[PDB]
Amino acid sequence: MASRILLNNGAKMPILGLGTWKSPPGQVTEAVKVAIDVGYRHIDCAHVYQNENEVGVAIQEKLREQVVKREELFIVSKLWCTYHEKGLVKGACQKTLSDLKLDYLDLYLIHWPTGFKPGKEFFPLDESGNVVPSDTNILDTWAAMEELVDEGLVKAIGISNFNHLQVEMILNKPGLKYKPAVNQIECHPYLTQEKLIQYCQSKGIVVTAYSPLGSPDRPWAKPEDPSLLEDPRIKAIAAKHNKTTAQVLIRFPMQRNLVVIPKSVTPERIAENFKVFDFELSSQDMTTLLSYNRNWRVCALLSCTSHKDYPFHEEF
Ligand SMILES: NC(=O)c1ccc[n+]([C@@H]2O[C@H](COP(=O)([O-])OP(=O)(O)OC[C@H]3O[C@@H](n4cnc5c(N)ncnc54)[C@H](OP(=O)(O)O)[C@@H]3O)[C@@H](O)[C@H]2O)c1
Ligand SMILES: COc1ccc(-c2nc3ccc(F)cc3c3c(=O)n(CC(=O)O)c(C)nc23)cc1
Structure with a gap:
């Protein structure tokens, strides 16, 4: 089992990474320090996980300890749904970079295809509990993501x-x-x-x-x-x-x-x-x-089923 897979930009991505959703801020620094100590080189992050500063601390420490160098790490983060507007994308990326204490990400993902109304709340609601969408579309958000590559x-x-x-x-x-x-x-x-x-x-x-x-x-x-x-x-x-x-x-x-x-x-x-x-x-x-498949989701984004870009109406 080679430990990395080749991407379209010529870089190699470790096939095993550490997830960080629900890793509480008060516990995740040690988790990432241990992970690096036992061999993980890929960390999956996101702004919405509310713990990127604590991930960044761990990484900084391990760099300063001479355990790893930056080029050996593969750090992933994701653009949250409230930042799909083209004029918000760079700032969202730079906030993750600042929190993680990094000067670049190895991979940055559009977290979900659904754009939400911009503002402080991650899941902005109206008075009946429906997610308030934004007037954003996949292609325009993608073009904004492309600019991030072109700017390094x-x-x-x-x-x-x-x-x-x-x-x-x-x-x-x-x-x-x-x-x-x-x-x-x-x-x-x-x-x-x-x-x-x-x-x-x-x-x-x-x-x-x-x-x-x-x-x-x-x-x-x-x-x-x-x-x-x-x-x-x-x-x-x-x-x-x-x-x-x-x-x-x-x-x-x-x-x-x-x-x-x-x-x-x-x-x-x-x-x-x-x-x-x-x-x-x-x-x-x-x-x-493979035979155990039941088409059963645990992340079905159920508050967003009426969003124009809800992904799970299609069979696949
Ligand atoms: N892109 C997206 O929309 C999206 C959505 C969901 C997840 N993700 C990413 O995928 C990562 C993984 O998914 P996930 O966090 O949903 O769940 P998961 O990795 O499937 O499961 C995590 C849970 O399993 C427990 N666990 C871990 N290793 C275990 C072991 N060896 N034995 C027994 N229990 C064990 C953890 O407990 P402890 O932590 O308490 O040990 C935690 O409760 C996320 O953290 C996030 O980085 C992305
Ligand atoms: C009823 O439908 C629902 C219910 C809950 C979630 C959900 N809510 C969150 C609220 C705050 C937050 F910071 C992260 C959440 C998150 C969150 O971070 N994740 C993980 C992810 O999107 O990677 C996921 C899968 N969902 C949530 C979404 C839809």
Whole structure:
């Protein structure tokens, strides 16, 4: 298993990264320090996670300790939905860079295709609980992202939570300057994404799988929801390999030529989750895990189902 995948800008992206959504600010600095100590070189960030300063502290410390140099790290962040207007994009990127204490990002993603009304609130609501959209569109936001590459703020740009038609809209954009390098999407045995992965990979777009463990800490979880980490069928595959269920769930997307970004703030789990380069899932294991698909999302952006750019009405 080579540890990096080649992107369209010529750069190599580590296939295993550390996720940081729901990593509380008071716990995430140590998590990122441990991750770097045990070998992670890719960190998945976002302004909306409200913890980029604390991520940046950890990175700074490890640079100053001589543990890693900047060129070996692969730092990803994402443009939040309230900043899709072309005149807001650069400032949003520069705020992430300032918080992270970096002079460039390796990859910057449009976090969701949906633009929201600009303002302080991340999910601005009217008086009936509907997300207030903005008058923004994918193509104009993409053009603003391209400017970030041309100014040296980011090495590559990509998208997240885009369906294949939304990806196609960018690919077919008149005067396209940069193709998306990555589409970061939810992917796990209950939502295997066969059609969207096939589409993206056929267009030379690398796919990153988010919520690979099923996001058991997501804030809207219901007790009756399916649970990957507790699935006895996956536990049995793990036992046969003398690995944990989480390790199987991380190895799975790696064998599909995906990047994967499991999140933890628990030092033992951070180290456990990286120890996935010493075993292989069999053809039968892969087939079996793919067979668990139920088209089941844990991140369905349910407050935005009437937005013009809501991504999940399309089959893929
Ligand atoms: N682009 C998007 O729209 C989007 C959406 C969702 C997620 N993401 C990215 O993807 C990352 C991963 O997804 P996620 O955070 O939703 O969830 P996840 O990585 O599927 O699961 C994280 C949860 O699993 C626990 N965990 C981690 N390792 C474990 C292990 N070895 N054994 C048992 N439990 C374990 C964590 O607990 P502790 O942390 O308490 O150890 C946490 O509760 C995010 O953090 C974010 O960076 C992006
Ligand atoms: C009812 O429909 C819903 C409910 C909740 C979320 C959600 N809310 C957030 C609120 C504040 C915040 F900082 C991040 C959120 C976030 C957030 O950061 N993520 C993670 C992501 O988008 O990467 C996700 C997936 N969702 C939220 C979204 C839609």
